[PDB]
Structure formats: C-alpha cells, structure tokens
Design a protein around this ligand. Sequence first.
Ligand SMILES: COc1ccc(Nc2ncnc3c2ccn3-c2ccc(C)c(C)c2)cc1Cl
Ligand SMILES: COc1ccc(Nc2ncnc3c2ccn3-c2ccc(C)c(C)c2)cc1Cl
Lengths: 297, 297
Amino acid sequence: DPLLSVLMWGVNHSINELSHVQIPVMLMPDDFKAYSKIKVDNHLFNKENMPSHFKFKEYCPMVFRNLRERFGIDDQDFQNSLTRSAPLPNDRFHTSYDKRYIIKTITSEDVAEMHNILKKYHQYIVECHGITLLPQFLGMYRLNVDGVEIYVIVTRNVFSHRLSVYRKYDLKGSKELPTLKDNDFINEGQKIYIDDNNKKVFLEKLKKDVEFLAQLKLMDYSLLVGIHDVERAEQLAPGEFDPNIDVYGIKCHENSPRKEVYFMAIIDILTHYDAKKTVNPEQYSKRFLDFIGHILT
Amino acid sequence: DPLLSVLMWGVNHSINELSHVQIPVMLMPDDFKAYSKIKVDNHLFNKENMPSHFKFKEYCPMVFRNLRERFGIDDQDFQNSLTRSAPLPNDRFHTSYDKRYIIKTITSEDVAEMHNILKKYHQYIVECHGITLLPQFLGMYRLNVDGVEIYVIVTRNVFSHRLSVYRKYDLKGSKELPTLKDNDFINEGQKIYIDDNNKKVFLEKLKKDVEFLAQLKLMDYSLLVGIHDVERAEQLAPGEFDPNIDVYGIKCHENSPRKEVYFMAIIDILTHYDAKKTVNPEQYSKRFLDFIGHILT
Ligand SMILES: COc1ccc(Nc2ncnc3c2ccn3-c2ccc(C)c(C)c2)cc1Cl
Ligand SMILES: COc1ccc(Nc2ncnc3c2ccn3-c2ccc(C)c(C)c2)cc1Cl
C-alpha cells in the first residue's frame, strides 16, 4: 500500500532528522506554526522500494516531539513501532504493528482544529504532568502519493498492547467504530468493578479533561471502554499490565465477580461546535459526565 | 557553508536510500538516464542544522554505485569520508576530510557530457577491471540553496590520502590548478626514477586510456604528477603506501638518486571538441602521449 510506505518512510525520516535537533529549554510561539515538508522524485530509479513520486509533511515537529516525551515515549521506540513493520488496517484506522499506536486518517478541517487547540492542549498536558484520559496526540502528517493527498494523526492506543479486549464500548451519554454503544451497555447490565479509590482518581481526571473540552467548544467525543477477561485468556503473569505502557488500564477490585481489567479513555475530540454550521458543548459535557458518573455508581 | 551542508546531507541520504536498493545482476539502459531528486522546506524549524530550503539531485545513482564498487570503494566508507566531517576548500575544489576524494564544481555542459560518455565510460571500466589512469567518477549531483544552483562531481584523489606531495605538475604536452607546468618540468630537469617494468605497465595504461579519450572527441586533459619525498618526510613504515587505496602510487627504483614516491594520473577530461564552437582530439592525444612517453624515456 503506497500510503503506508510513504508514512513509514516519512516517520523514519522525521525522527532521524529530529535526532540532530537539540532538545529545547522550552517551546517557542513559532514552534506551533512550524512544519517540515519533503518531496521525492525518482525517475527510473528505486521502482521497487516504494512510489516514485510522493510528498510528506510533518506539522509542528518540535511540539509533538515534546508531547511524546511528556507521555513517556522515546523517539527511537516510536520510530521502531511505526517502521519495523507495516501498520495493520481495520476493515477505518491502522494499528502500529506492536499495537502501541493508532494511525488515523483525518480531514484538513480536523488538522486545522488540532492546530487551533495545540497551544492549550500542550499547556493542559504540562499542567497535569501528562496524566489525562484525553487522546495523546503523538504526531501529525500530510501524505501525497499520485494525486492522492491525505492527513493522518497518531495517538496512543487506549487498549493494552498485550492483553486482549473481548468487549468494547464507545460511550457518549445520549461512520463509527466496531464497538457497542450506550444502549447496549445499558441493556447488557454492564458493570465495571473497580474500587472507590480508582473511581475517584478516574472521575476527577475525567471532570477536568471534559471541562477542558467544553472550554474549547469541542464535542462528539466519547469514552472508549475495553474489557479484558482473564479467565477467558486461560482458554508479566496473568492479569498483569505495565501501567507505564498500558497507561489507561485499571484492575478490577478484590470482589469483582469476574477477573477483568479495564481500559477506558476519551477519544475523537476534534469536532468544534462551529464546524457544525442541536447540542452545545456545555450540554454535551453535562450529558457526557452525567452518564459516566452514572455507569460507575 | 550552506552548499557543503546540503552536499553532506544529500550524500548521506543518497547512500542510505541506496542501502535499501538491491545490488542488480547488471545495469539496464534506463540506469544511465535515471535520477533521484529531493526538495526540503522547513518553515520555522531546524534553523540551526542547515538551510531551511534546498534541493538535491543525484544522477544515475545505480551507475555510480556500480563504479564505486568496481573501483574498490565501499558505500559506507564513501558516505563516512563525505559526511563525518566537512570537505576542506582550496583557495577551486574541495577534498574529503580524510583526503580520499575530490569534490569539484562543474558546469551543466560538463554534466551533459558526463552523461553522453557514461555508458562507454562504464564499459571501458569493466573491460579494464577498474585498472586505469582516467578520473574515477564516483558520484554526480545538483545542489540548490537559496537561488544558488550548482553541479558537483566526486573523483578519487590522485594523491595519497597519507603521504604528502611536496611537488606537483599538470602536464599537457604543448582557470588552472596550483601546479607546475610543462615548461617547468622541462626547465627544472625533472626526472621520474621508476623501473622499466613500471614504465611499461604505466604507459600501456596511458595509451589505451588516451585512445579512449580521442575516440570520444575529448580534449584538454592532463597528467597530474605528484612527488612525495621520503627523506624530507624525515624532518605503514616510511615510504609505504597502501596500493589498494593510493591506487596511482609508484615507488622509485633501487637506484633513484632520491627516495621518491610518485602519483600520476589523468585529470579533467570532460571537454568535448565540439563544445569549442586550433587542435583536434587526435592531434591532442598524439601530442599528449608523445610528451609523456618522452618525459619517461
Ligand atoms: C478493534 O477495535 C479497536 C481497537 C483499538 C482501539 N483503540 C483506539 N485507541 C485510541 N484512539 C483510537 C482507537 C481507535 C480509533 N482511535 C482514534 C484515533 C484518532 C482519531 C482522530 C479517532 C477519531 C479515533 C479502538 C478500537 Cl474500536
Ligand atoms: C594541492 O593541490 C592538489 C591536491 C590534490 C589534487 N588531486 C586531484 N585528484 C583528482 N582530481 C582532481 C584533483 C584536483 C582537482 N581534481 C579535479 C577533479 C574533478 C574535475 C572535474 C577536475 C577538473 C579536477 C590536485 C591538486 Cl592540484
């Protein structure tokens, strides 16, 4: 697939170039308006590695390098995950081959919005020491191969890179991914057996994160919820995840009826209210937090 | 200097890309019409490593890779010589920092001529197993930084990368480099004390090489002659050179009045007769070989 080739090639180039750039003492205003573009033309050469004619553009390379650091991600590890082997498609989005990252096609509009929030996003991240349920935006690029132009973004996978998820929801509190929905969560009677301390830590993150979203007039986000079943996985020792990698995982409590491990975080935030030119951002967050607070009562 | 930066950067990229390309069982006709171009644009990014906006084009990358191999040169070694440290200028041409290679600015006309002869050049090289006094053309590029476009070519240094040359001539047999000339060779009474076997091997190379030149209607070439003085170098053990690296070196004979080592080869061949739109190529070679055969009598 020529678009994955260019992505793998562009990321590889992106990180290697960056390896020559000094880690700054701080980001500057201009860092949030910067880009690197590269255009390759091979005439009668290299027909076999990948396409002869392509472009690759990286937005705000210093910023996303900074964010990778703040999210506990090493540039060389990142490069490896995206280049050692091709991303795996999903009937859409890809997964890095080691399942650490999601690669997702987005619109120019989405790209523009990511730009409009990137300063506030950064600041929010600093302020919370990288501990948040918001998407972790790791890099953002434009590809051209042939007359096909596309925008992609890379986020941390909400789910474990190792523990399998036998059941998944996407919750809004009121096209779309292969998940179960609000109504299904309700009808199924789905419970999440985590302790009071873990509910408290989780919700107090959610409340701040969501408030940030409302302030930005963003909407239509949801809480992605994945359940690993441990006794099923019998058919790091069993039930274990590295928290430093599987950053959204929370163990069930001692009295959970089933040995579960849960992966919950916010996804798909880049819809601005005005872009819908219904529900305002305030009403959306209010419904959203009420539903989440509810299903975790 | 932004033009050396782009060159170092372009070569580095050139060889690394090539490291992914399979060594072919043979060159194809299209290999001699091929190129790779790359254009970089950095807005508000990477201001410190090198220029923000540049282009780099490599001509016939498969061909010059082949020639590097046939001349006993490993691609990674080549890359290192040109990138580990900046080329050193000459008041003009540069030297690779380890003195193995010459980098030389040339005209588009020269570039066009290199192209016109590149097939015959290749064939000639094969036929003689790489043993020749002709320039060893190792790579050829176009650089653009700012609105400054330039063409460069890389050849093997005629002189030792290690033994110093205290005296240099550029001989034609009838602007210009820092060398002594025909008349000076004559007035000085300059002798070259090599044995009959070495004269014979050298001249029989020269005769074939020069004949090749005449066949191509090339002109205005010369024999670059450099003398290392061994007793002076007292003010690999003394007098030694690796022939595999210092490919043009010939030891003086047992009865030379002074312990010398000599570096002789042909340079500066890319002038085609027609380009001068005097002396024809035949007369030029005839004068040239007669003078060389003469100074080695
Ligand atoms: C087998 O099913 C799954 C496997 C894995 C996942 N995990 C994800 N972790 C984080 N972001 C994600 C995903 C999926 C998509 N996105 C994502 C990214 C970025 C944008 C901009 C948008 C809109 C979505 C979700 C599912 Cl369903
Ligand atoms: C200190 O002085 C020197 C040190 C070193 C050298 N050695 C060289 N070995 C091979 N080609 C060379 C040179 C110099 C130039 N060129 C060269 C290359 C390519 C083109 C196209 C043209 C015209 C010349 C010569 C001198 Cl004088």
